[PDB]
Amino acid sequence: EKTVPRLHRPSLQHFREQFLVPGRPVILKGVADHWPCMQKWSLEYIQEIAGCRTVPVEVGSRYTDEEWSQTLMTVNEFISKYIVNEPRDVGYLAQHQLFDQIPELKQDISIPDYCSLGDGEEEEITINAWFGPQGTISPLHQDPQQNFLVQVMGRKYIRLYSPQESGALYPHNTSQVDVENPDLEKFPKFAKAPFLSCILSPGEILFIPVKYWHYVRALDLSFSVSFWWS
Amino acid sequence: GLIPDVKLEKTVPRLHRPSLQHFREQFLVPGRPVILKGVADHWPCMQKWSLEYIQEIAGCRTVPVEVGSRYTDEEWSQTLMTVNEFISKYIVNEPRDVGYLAQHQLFDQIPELKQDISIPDYCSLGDGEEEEITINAWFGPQGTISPLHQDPQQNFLVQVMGRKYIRLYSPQESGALYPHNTSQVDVENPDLEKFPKFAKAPFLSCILSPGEILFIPVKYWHYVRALDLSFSVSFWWS
Ligand SMILES: O=C(O)CCC(=O)C(=O)O
Numbered sequence: 001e002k003t004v005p006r007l008h009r010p011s012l013q014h015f016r017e018q019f020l021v022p023g024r025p026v027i028l029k030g031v032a033d034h035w036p037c038m039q040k041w042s043l044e045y046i047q048e049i050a051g052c053r054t055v056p057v058e059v060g061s062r063y064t065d066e067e068w069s070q071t072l073m074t075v076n077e078f079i080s081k082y083i084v085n086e087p088r089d090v091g092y093l094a095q096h097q098l099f100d101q102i103p104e105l106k107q108d109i110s111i112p113d114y115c116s117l118g119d120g121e122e123e124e125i126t127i128n129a130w131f132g133p134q135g136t137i138s139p140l141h142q143d144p145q146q147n148f149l150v151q152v153m154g155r156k157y158i159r160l161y162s163p164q165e166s167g168a169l170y171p172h173n174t175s176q177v178d179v180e181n182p183d184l185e186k187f188p189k190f191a192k193a194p195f196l197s198c199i200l201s202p203g204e205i206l207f208i209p210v211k212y213w214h215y216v217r218a219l220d221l222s223f224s225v226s227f228w229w230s
Numbered sequence: 231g232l233i234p235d236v237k238l239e240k241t242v243p244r245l246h247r248p249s250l251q252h253f254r255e256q257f258l259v260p261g262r263p264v265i266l267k268g269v270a271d272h273w274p275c276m277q278k279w280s281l282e283y284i285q286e287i288a289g290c291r292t293v294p295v296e297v298g299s300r301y302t303d304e305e306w307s308q309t310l311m312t313v314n315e316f317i318s319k320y321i322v323n324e325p326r327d328v329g330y331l332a333q334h335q336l337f338d339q340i341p342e343l344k345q346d347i348s349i350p351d352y353c354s355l356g357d358g359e360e361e362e363i364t365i366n367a368w369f370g371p372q373g374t375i376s377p378l379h380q381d382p383q384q385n386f387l388v389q390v391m392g393r394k395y396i397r398l399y400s401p402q403e404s405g406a407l408y409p410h411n412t413s414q415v416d417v418e419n420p421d422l423e424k425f426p427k428f429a430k431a432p433f434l435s436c437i438l439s440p441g442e443i444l445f446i447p448v449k450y451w452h453y454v455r456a457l458d459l460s461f462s463v464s465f466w467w468s
């Protein structure tokens with residue numbers, strides 16, 4: 001497939017002019033790979049620091065509002081039931097501001113310098129945790145802000161469609177199409193829609209331009225951190 | 231739950247930042263207790279460690295919690311629980327029984343907390359190595375009691391939150407304390423008949439407040455009762 005480009009610590013100017021302004025995706029290397037989270041986060045570290053904390057957990061496909069659901073449980077309960085022993089069902093600790101809830105963890109991360117290129121102020125950047133077993137899947141969708149998706153534990157497969165291709169994406173903000181199991185009959189335009197893809201690995205940051213369409217499956221036990229900014 | 235009448239008892243002397251040399255010659259060598267003022271009062275823990283701060287950072291960690299008084303081995307016991315469950319059951323609202331997060335090396339367990347304290351300069355006067363210093367947390371509701379006892383090293387007990395009534399007896403007074411090392415005597419309710427030699431034994435005492443450091447010389451007998459919700463840090467050094 002066509003792969004998202006990878007750059008080691010590109011200047012602020014180059015990032016702005018070649019990716020930010022024109023809305024082109026890119027993977028940034030050498031930027032987050034030495035944040036303390038990269039060496040510190042593990043099942044055991046997370047359980048030790050945050051195991052007792054209460055967090056929202058998704059179960060089900062996020063294609064339709066009616067198709068998924070969240071329940072509150074401790075981090076230990078979530079790891080026990082959905083990661084370790086020995087998951088029948090798929091649970092995802094997704095889209096949760098864990099780092100406002102647990103300021104100890106926020107110390108293990110950092111706000112990417114590139115964020116200073118936007119209009120908004122730093123305090124207004126939304127930082128979400130995405131913590132889950134191999135096999136979690138976020139259906140194709142778009143978000144209203146710029147995004148730096150930081151991979152911390154494990155790898156994700158990520159597929160990206162320009163907003164220029166919204167039409168071939170048979171929306172309902174979220175696509176009706178199962179990106180990895182599409183129905184060629186029900187949505188013909190899809191299969192020839194062009195895209196970029198990647199396997200996002202620890203230390204790596206994917207820049208997802210505002211409104212850019214993205215699909216995401218965790219290949220391993222996974223932990224990512226997104227920064228929604230403007 | 232009564233603030234004792236300390237101005238009627240001999241008080242431990244208080245000094246503001248005595249010099250190392252004065253501390254060495256007049257307190258360490260002869261083994262005399264003293265309260266050091268103006269040394270720890272600006273440690274970050276002094277402003278930082280509210281009850282809510284401690285719960286936020288440390289809440290999930292498992293910690294040993296003592297129940298019962300330590301007058302003999304069989305009279306007390308420890309339960310391992312989270313800091314949250316300790317605070318919940320033994321600190322907040324109206325707890326029925328007394329629990330004490332006592333004598334626990336919380337600072338090796340949660341190293342970030344080390345940034346909020348320091349090794350007192352005076353420790354460099356000992357023979358030991360800085361790494362060999364043992365730092366313990368003592369976190370408990372109003373009313374915890376540590377019975378009269380001695381420890382085998384020098385001690386700087388730093389008060390961070392709340393106050394403690396402390397009574398001290400020199401090693402030369404052991405006879406009048408009826409050791410079983412620990413004493414059989416309940417300092418604040420002594421049995422005069424069973425322990426006749428206790429009433430006249432000489433002692434120093436104090437109410438130790440936040441920011442203050444109590445120097446307990448090696449083997450000096452000490453008894454401690456928390457007057458409020460309390461948090462102390464001890465440095466056992468040699
Ligand atoms: O990582 C995922 O599973 C979804 C990420 C995402 O949609 C986002 O960060 O905006």
Ligand SMILES: O=C(O)CCC(=O)C(=O)O
Nearest residue numbers: 368376381387454462464
């Ligand atoms: O703070 C207490 O209750 C006891 C302190 C103590 O015995 C010590 O630090 O040696």
Ligand code: NI
Nearest residue numbers: 141142143214
């Ligand atoms: Ni998204």
Ligand code: NI
Nearest residue numbers: 379380381452
């Ligand atoms: Ni002691």
